[model samples]
Target: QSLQDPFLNALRRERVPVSIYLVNGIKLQGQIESWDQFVILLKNTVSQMVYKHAISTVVPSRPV
Candidate 1:
């Protein structure tokens, strides 16, 4: 398994609402739409492309 696979799988398997905190002090709330080695595509009020390395933390929201 590749290093990114675990991260990718987690995002894919969960597919739940999340709050992503970035190193730049930006917070994104969304559901993970897709991901690759370099980036994650999230869909919320607006679609956003977030760099993997830029993520400081990921908080999974309550399942609804």
Candidate 2:
């Protein structure tokens, strides 16, 4: 898989990984260009990884 978007490409070139989302509700410690992109990446990641192994729909509630 390749991140072909111009902004993502630039961040990859700079060796900057997206770290806007939290792990276990703890803030990830790093810099990201945009929260929107990070959320998209996080959602895609969870969908591809988590959803791949389980037989259920993953959805966040009002609290999260």
Candidate 3:
């Protein structure tokens, strides 16, 4: 089991908006769509496939 699942599930099920930052400090904003162990496909309608290793922070609009 992984702690990432619980947190990701909350954002996904709740449909919360978030500002996910990559390691380079670029802010990628969107609501959680779906994800696997390696990457997160967030809504951009224009969805960007971001690698987990490149992500530094997952800042939700509000607490779960």
Candidate 4:
């Protein structure tokens, strides 16, 4: 089973906004439009869900 279902679900439902730093020092922005739609695609296509697992595995990774 693909573990990203829960993570993607949350992103889609929440319409989470994301930003990425590119090689040119540019910021790329994106938003999860339809969790329902994307989840279907992600489950079918992705081999290993990287972001999803990383998020769930956080431990001493975050500092307050």
Deviation (Å) of 8 in candidate 3:
0.5
Clashing pairs in 4: none
- Give a tens-digit lDDT track for model 1, residues 1-62: 38556754576586767888999988988888887778888887877899989998877775
lDDT of 4 by residue, 1-64 (tens): 3654565456546555444333455443454333332232222233222233223221211121
Q: Please, what are the lDDT tens digits per residue for candidate 2 over residues 1-64? A: 1533555445544645443333344333232233232233332233322211222222222111
TM-score of model 2 vs. true structure = 0.27
**lDDT per prediction?**
0.78, 0.33, 0.89, 0.36
**Model 1 worst lDDT run, 10 consecutive residues:** 1-10
User: For model 2, where is the 10-residue window of minimal lDDT?
Assistant: 48-57
Better of 3 and 4 by lDDT: 3
Candidate 2 — which residues are off by over 4 angstroms?
1-4, 22-64
Model 1 TM-score relative to the real fold:
0.70
TM for every model, in the order presented, reads 0.70, 0.27, 0.91, 0.33
* lDDT computed for candidate 1: 0.78
Error of 4 at 44 (Å): 24
Q: Which whole-number lDDT from 0 to 100 does residue 39 have in model 4? A: 31
Higher-lDDT candidate of 1 and 2: 1
Query: Which 10-residue span in candidate 3 carries the lowest summed lDDT?
Result: 41-50
